[PDB]
Amino acid sequence: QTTTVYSLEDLLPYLKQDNVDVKLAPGTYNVNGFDVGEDRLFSTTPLFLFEGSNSTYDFTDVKLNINTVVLTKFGNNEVNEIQILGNNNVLKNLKLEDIGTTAPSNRAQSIVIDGRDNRIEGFHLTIRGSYPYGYGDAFGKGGGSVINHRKHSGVLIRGLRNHLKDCTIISRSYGHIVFMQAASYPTVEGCYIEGEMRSTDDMLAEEGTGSPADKVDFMTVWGYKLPAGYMMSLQEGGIRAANAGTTYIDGVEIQRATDNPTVLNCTIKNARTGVTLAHANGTKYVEGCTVLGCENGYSIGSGTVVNCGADAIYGPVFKNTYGSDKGYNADITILPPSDAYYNGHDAVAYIGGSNHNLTFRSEITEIPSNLKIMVSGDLQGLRVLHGSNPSQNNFAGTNIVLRNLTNFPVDLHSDSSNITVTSCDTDNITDNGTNNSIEAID
Numbered sequence: 001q002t003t004t005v006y007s008l009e010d011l012l013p014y015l016k017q018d019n020v021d022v023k024l025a026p027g028t029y030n031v032n033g034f035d036v037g038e039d040r041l042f043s044t045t046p047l048f049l050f051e052g053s054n055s056t057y058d059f060t061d062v063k064l065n066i067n068t069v070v071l072t073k074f075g076n077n078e079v080n081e082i083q084i085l086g087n088n089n090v091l092k093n094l095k096l097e098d099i100g101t102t103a104p105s106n107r108a109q110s111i112v113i114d115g116r117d118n119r120i121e122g123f124h125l126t127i128r129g130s131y132p133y134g135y136g137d138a139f140g141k142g143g144g145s146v147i148n149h150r151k152h153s154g155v156l157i158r159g160l161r162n163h164l165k166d167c168t169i170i171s172r173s174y175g176h177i178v179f180m181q182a183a184s185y186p187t188v189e190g191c192y193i194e195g196e197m198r199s200t201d202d203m204l205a206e207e208g209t210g211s212p213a214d215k216v217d218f219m220t221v222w223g224y225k226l227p228a229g230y231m232m233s234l235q236e237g238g239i240r241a242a243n244a245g246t247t248y249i250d251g252v253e254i255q256r257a258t259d260n261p262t263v264l265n266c267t268i269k270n271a272r273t274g275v276t277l278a279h280a281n282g283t284k285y286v287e288g289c290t291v292l293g294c295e296n297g298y299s300i301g302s303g304t305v306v307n308c309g310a311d312a313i314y315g316p317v318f319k320n321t322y323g324s325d326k327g328y329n330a331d332i333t334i335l336p337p338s339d340a341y342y343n344g345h346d347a348v349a350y351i352g353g354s355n356h357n358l359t360f361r362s363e364i365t366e367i368p369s370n371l372k373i374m375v376s377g378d379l380q381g382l383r384v385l386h387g388s389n390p391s392q393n394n395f396a397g398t399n400i401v402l403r404n405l406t407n408f409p410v411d412l413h414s415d416s417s418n419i420t421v422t423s424c425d426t427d428n429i430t431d432n433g434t435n436n437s438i439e440a441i442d
Contacts, residue, residue, distance in 0.1 A: 002058070009041055011048075018052040018086065026061030036073040046080035046112070053086035053115070059094030068102035068129030071152070076106045083112040084120075084159075085248060093122040098173070103131035103150040109175075110153070114248045116160035123167040127154045130173040132212055135203060136232040136272065137174075138220045139213065146221050147212050151175045153236070157186045158247035166190040176236040177271055180258040180280070181245025188239055189264040195235030195271045197293060197314065199342060200382075201228045222388040230344035230382045231314040233295055238271030239263055241280035257281050269293055269338075274310055277301060278321035291317070292338045295382070302327040309333035312371060313341045315381075318349040318358070323395030325353030334362035334406060346370040346380040348408050352397040362406035373404060375433070377413035397433075405441075412436050 004023045005011050008031070014022045036042045047070070050057075071079045081096065096110065110127055113120065130152040132139065139147035153175030155164060162183065169191060171177045177193050180186045203226060206214050218226040241258040248254070259282035267290045268274045274291030277284050277300040284303025290310075291297045297310030297317035302325060310317035310332060317334055334348065348371045351358065360373065376397045384393035396415040404410055404421065409428035412419055416433030423429060426440045 012041070014052075014055075015048060015050050016052060018054055020052065020055045022055065023058040023060075024062050028063045028065065030065045030067070031070055032067040033069040033073055036070055042070070045074045045077065046083035048082045050082070050084040050089055050091070051086055052089070054088045055086070056090045056092075058092055060092070062094055064094060064096045065099050066096065068098050068100040071104035071108050071129055072102060074105065078106055079104060079108045080112050081108075081110045083114065084118050085114050087115045087117055087250070089115070089118045091118075091120045091123070095124040097126040098128035098152075100129065101133070101172075102129050104129065104152055105150070107150060108152040109156045112156040112158065113162045113164075114159045115162070116249055117162070118159065119163040119165060120155075120167065121165040123169075125154055125167065125169045127152055127169070127171040127173040127175065127177070130175060133172075133174050133234060134198060135213055136198070136234055137236060138200075138203070138226055138232065139216065140221045141236065144221070146216050146219060149174065154178060156181060157188070158183050158245065159249055160184045161187075163187045163189070164191060168192045169194070171195045171235045174234060174236070176240050177238050179237055179240045179242055180261060181242040182247040182254060182256045183241075183258045183261070184256075185260045185262070186258065187262045187264070188266055191266045193238045193266060193271065194269040195233050195238070197231050197233055197270050200226050200230045200232060200344075203232075204228055222383055222385070224386050224388070227344070227382065227385065231295070231342040232382070233270055233272040235271050237273045237276055238268035238291070238294060239266065239275045240273055241277045243279045260284075264288055266290075267292070272296070274298060275300065277303070278325070290335070292335070298330065298332060300328065301325055303329070305330040305332060307331065309335040311335040311338050312343060312348045313337045313339050314343055315345050316347050316349050318351070318360075320350060320352040320356070320397075322391050323352050326355050328353065328356045328358070330357070331359045332361070334360060334364060334408070336364065341368050343368065343371065344380065344382060347372055347374045349373045350377075350379045350381075351375045351400060351402065352395045354398045354400070356400040358401065359403040360406050360408070362408065365407060367407055367409070371408060373402070373408050373410040375400065375402065375410070375412045375419055376415035377411065
């Protein structure tokens with residue numbers, strides 16, 4: 001009942017068919033610039049457009065090598081290597097690697113998942129080729145950039161009930177590793193997600209070289225010269241819900257926020273954010289995850305984070321995004337450091353909003369002197385200095401349960417009120433808020 005094909009040329013017709021069971025024979029397949037043309041195999045982008053429904057595609061032992069020059073062969077248009085438009089499709093075990101580091105002419109997304117009830121399982125994806133690469137988002141991630149960009153993202157989850165399962169996503173590109181736009185009930189489960197880091201001091205050492213950052217005198221889009229002392233990711237989000245977007249389901253174009261995301265048992269390493277879902281609506285659930293060396297650990301806005309862990313070497317494990325945050329319930333383990341501490345944010349957590357139930361657990365005995373649990377106050381975060389992103393800093397906290405089962409100190413700012421604090425040690429808790437309760441525990 002399974003059709004096996006032995007070339008990308010013979011694969012493509014099946015992508016336009018419904019109810020097919022297709023296997024691409026074990027082997028290596030190469031997509032290079034010569035392969036993209038009007039009379040060539042890849043006439044249009046997306047390269048692999050899964051338009052059919054109710055189909056299964058097996059890519060076991062398939063290595064698909066896509067030369068990044070392909071990202072420049074479609075004019076000034078977005079290039080997507082893989083897009084699923086149908087429903088009830090299963091794609092499994094493909095190994096996809098972006099070859100070379102050539103930047104996209106405009107922008108690129110390796111995999112885009114529209115439709116409903118699709119699953120991508122067991123993929124191994126390596127993302128390469130973007131501009132600028134080496135600065136993170138310091139000189140622009142959207143419009144009005146200090147340095148113009150050609151972003152390359154990895155997996156874009158849209159549609160309805162679409163599922164990313166047991167995948168490895170390695171990024172060496174300036175883009176989100178895994179993100180959700182206009183997605184209803186997306187689920188990310190069992191995935192390993194990894195980017196790479198670079199200190200702002202290393203960036204600043206480009207002074208005099210004529211680098212692109214050197215030529216703008218390191219003036220960031222946040223309004224100030226790039227500060228030393230921070231560790232940045234070269235990628236954007238690890239698992240992120242975008243603000244708003246467009247998806248396609250059953251020939252219906254839909255503009256909406258992401259809603260009801262679920263993230264289960266994922267390890268995220270060296271991204272801008274471990275798991276950030278504050279922009280998603282509906283029920284948010286994050287369970288069993290590990291976040292290592294990210295600039296921020298967990299920021300889902302509201303919902304549940306349970307049985308999760310983050311280390312604190314490069315940024316806070318937990319951040320309330322806005323003062324409008326409400327009903328954030330979290331049980332987070334501060335993991336032992338995966339590398340030396342280089343956390344310029346001067347906080348292991350920033351807590352604000354109202355009606356939160358927060359538990360922090362750790363075995364760490366050696367606490368860096370700048371690391372503190374903050375309830376309200378002026379976070380020294382890289383992107384919120386000197387009034388930048390003002391809704392994400394300097395906001396009040398009210399009616400919050402804080403169970404500090406850690407040796408980390410707690411600072412309650414004067415904008416904090418009705419904070420119920422239990423801690424291993426209350427001697428390192430400073431309270432300048434209103435009607436805060438502070439009880440020690442064994």
